[PDB]
Amino acid sequence: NFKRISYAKTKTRAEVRGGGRKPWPQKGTGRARHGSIRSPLWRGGGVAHGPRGPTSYYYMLPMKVRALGLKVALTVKLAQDDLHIMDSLELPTGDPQYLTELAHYRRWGDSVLLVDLTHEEMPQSIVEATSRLKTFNLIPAVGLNVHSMLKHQTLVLTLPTVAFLEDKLLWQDSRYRPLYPFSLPYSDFP
Amino acid sequence: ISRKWEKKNKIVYPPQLPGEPRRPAEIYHCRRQIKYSKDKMWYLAKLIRGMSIDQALAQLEFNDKKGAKIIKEVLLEAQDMAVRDHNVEFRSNLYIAESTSGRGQCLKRIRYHGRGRFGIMEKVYCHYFVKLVEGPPPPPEPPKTAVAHAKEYIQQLRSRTIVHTL
């Protein structure tokens, strides 16, 4: 929900076209008192409590909570015998039927999220393989997240990926207050 | 708009076995969108309802209403289709089984009342349905005599029980 901006809008009783004067004056006729057409009672009126403008739903959790969620989801993927760790994603052929037959033979699951790191050392074989499959996904290790890990059945990491994840997620433990945002120099932190 | 009284003439029953009665013929016919009010048409439809078709034509030839000529036309052409298409052999041997009138689609007008005021005049339309069945007209239900009244009263007194106990 933090990315969501909903573009719903309706017109209030001041934005609907027309509706200026008072139809049928207050005391004469025997109809109900009305001060304007396009009031919300009327057919063709404006909405009284409708949605208003492109509304944003943005909020950020504390960063320790998000890193704790990532560690929790990695633990949940490990303990239920779902996680598999590879030395290097490299297929011999690079055709998708090999990949789906291997995932069937090893009894992984119907969907599996494959992770490599740094997005440029992804070799051509696994990219040409899973660029056509619909349930198998490649992401760089920067794009790991709780939603994709829950959505896919298993989760396949790499040994440089698991070292990267241990470093980036254990850095939240034993860290100070910010003192300014961490993109600034900070002698230890790259 | 729903037109199902027209489609009732297209039913086809299976062929009857020899050890069975006759199954008299049934003929449905209707005239849509008559320029006549449905109440005044209903009075004529209630006039006919039980009579034979020749007696219906005789009563409708001398009734001095706008709907009488209309219903006489409908009954005459239903007699003609009954003898021609649905295989009734005798022209006279038909009685009116159902006879009723329904609302048709109406229009609306203004009536121009006598200030800057107005009403909604409505141009009325109606239908007429009829169903003929071959055979003599059924005898009227005779009014109950004192014997039947007494028999039902004694049956009522014989029917009662000791209530609110075993």
């Binding site: 004056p25 005391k27 004469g28 | 800057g116 107005f118």
Partner: peptide
């Protein structure tokens, strides 16, 4: 006073 209200005609298309 002389209180009076004019009649309101509806539109003609109805």
């Amino acid at each position: 006073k002389k209180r009076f209200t004019p009649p309101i005609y509806q539109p003609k298309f109805k």
